Curated annotation (Swiss-Prot):
Function text: Cyclic nucleotide synthase (second messenger synthase) of a CBASS antivirus system. CBASS (cyclic oligonucleotide-based antiphage signaling system) provides immunity against bacteriophages. The CD-NTase protein (DncV, this protein) synthesizes cyclic nucleotides in response to infection; these serve as specific second messenger signals. The signals activate a diverse range of effectors, leading to bacterial cell death and thus abortive phage infection. A type II-A(GA) CBASS system.
Family statement drawn from the similarity comment of this UniProt entry: Belongs to the CD-NTase family. A01 subfamily.
Protein name per the record: Cyclic GMP-AMP synthase
GO molecular function: 3',3'-cyclic GMP-AMP synthase activity; ATP binding; diguanylate cyclase activity; GTP binding; metal ion binding
InterPro entries: DncV-like_NTFase, DncV_C, GAMP_synthase
């Protein structure tokens, strides 16, 4: 029968969905610049703290003098009690802890969609691009305190926020965050302890709760996804972008996580025949199978995760039910677009899935299927 084809609608890098979703080089460079600012300040803060520790190694300074020294560094941007705590922790170090600290130089690695190239331009007002730049503290396997490390990273991020109008700090359970509302951007800074020189010894720092650390190596997800792209093909990054774009269009705030969409989509494309020469059909195939993937619970590609990426249906409350509803509707949307009574209606319908981003109906062509 006659059908509308959406392959260019999806893939066209001029003004198709890929063209609308991929960051411009100016945006990508802006994110790399922001990343560099954070990394340099974090390096500096640790050097400033280490300078104080060096002074105390040389002579057992009074608490008051150590406090004075702290107040001249970037740590002056923490609260008074936090400054006290930093000075107290430096004061309380024994020779071994201090020697270990003097040998610590933070390292950095970006995780998430900036790293494996699936970061979309944000859609709705309020939505922001994220760059996830982790800070890594090489230490003996378990020697340098959870409290001090978090205070120093917080000092770095808070000192930058104090110097830049329109920057805000947010403490999250798994990271420090700088939000730049006007740039529709935030940078997330998770902190890890790793061995000094094996994913079992990569420990993510948690801010509050019964645990200070949890073993969660972001490299596991990065390698899993990069390997999946190689295995499945160049269309995997594209259809993950498209599913994330659908999520951004259906929910202002909320919806399924990006990682849950990636995991379910990889599962489907590993197991169901599809055709990269028609990403319209491929998206319909993915859409038909996502509800079953999500209803049974979406497993993490990291087997050590304590919970699935999305819960099985007997655990659903209103939010998961809403996500299932939208997932169920998606293949119907795509099917209806395919059989629309005109090109303009085909576009209107498929944009009910991905939002009114693509406006060029010449990317939709009359086909047979
Ligand atoms: N093991 C594990 N890692 C996670 C989980 N959620 C997030 N992460 C890690 O955090 C990184 C960034 O996660 P997100 O910001 O949610 O996802 P993203 O792929 O960057 O997608 P967008 O920011 O929406 O573009 C992932 O690549 C993982 O390394 C999780 O549930 N389990
Ligand atoms: N290694 C690792 N990193 C994670 C994991 N989960 C989240 N992250 C990182 O930490 C950042 C913050 O995660 P979250 O606090 O869960 O984001 P959120 O709770 O949705 O914050 P809001 O957008 O304000 O609702 C993410 O962008 C990831 O980069 C994880 O399980 N493992
Ligand atoms: Mg991210
Ligand atoms: Mg994020």
């Amino acid at each position: 029968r006659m059908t509308w084809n959406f392959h260019q609608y999806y893939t066209n890098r001029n003004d198709g969905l890929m063209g609308k979703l991929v960051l411009t080089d100016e945006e990508k460079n802006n994110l790399k610049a922001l990343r560099k600012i954070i990394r340099l300040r974090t390096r500096d803060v640790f050097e400033e703290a280490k300078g104080i520790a060096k002074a105390v190694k040389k002579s057992a300074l009074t608490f008051e003098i150590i406090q004075e020294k702290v107040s001249t560094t970037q740590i002056k941007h923490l609260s008074d009690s936090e400054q006290r705590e930093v000075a107290k922790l430096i004061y309380e170090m024994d020779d071994d802890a201090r020697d270990e600290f003097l040998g610590l130089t933070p390292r950095f690695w970006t995780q998430g969609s900036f790293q494996y190239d699936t970061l979309n331009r944000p859609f709705q007002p309020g939505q922001e691009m994220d760059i996830d730049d982790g800070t890594y503290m090489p230490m003996p396997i378990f020697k340098i305190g959870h409290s001090l490390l978090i205070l120093l990273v917080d000092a770095s991020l808070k000192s930058l926020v104090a110097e830049n109008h329109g920057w805000k700090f947010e403490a999250k359970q798994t990271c420090g965050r700088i939000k730049i509302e006007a740039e529709k951007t935030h940078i997330d800074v998770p902190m890890y302890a790793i061995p000094k020189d094996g994913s079992e010894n990569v420990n993510l720092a948690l801010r509050e709760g019964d645990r200070k650390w949890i073993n969660s190596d972001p490299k596991i997800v990065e390698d899993w996804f990069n390997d999946s792209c190689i295995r499945i093909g160049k269309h995997l990054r594209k259809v993950c972008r498209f599913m994330k774009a659908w999520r951004d269009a259906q929910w202002d705030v909320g919806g399924p996580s990006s990682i849950s969409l990636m995991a379910a989509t990889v599962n489907i494309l590993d197991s169901v025949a599809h055709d990269a020469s028609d990403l319209g059909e491929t998206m319909k195939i993915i859409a038909k199978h996502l509800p079953s993937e999500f209803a049974r619970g979406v497993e993490s590609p990291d087997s050590t995760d304590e919970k699935p990426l999305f819960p099985p249906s007997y655990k659903h409350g209103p939010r998961e039910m809403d996500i299932m509803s939208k997932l169920e509707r998606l293949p119907e949307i795509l099917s209806s677009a395919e059989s629309a009574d005109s090109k303009s209606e085909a576009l209107k319908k498929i944009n009910m899935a991905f939002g009114n981003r693509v406006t060029n109906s010449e990317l939709i062509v009359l086909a047979k299927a």
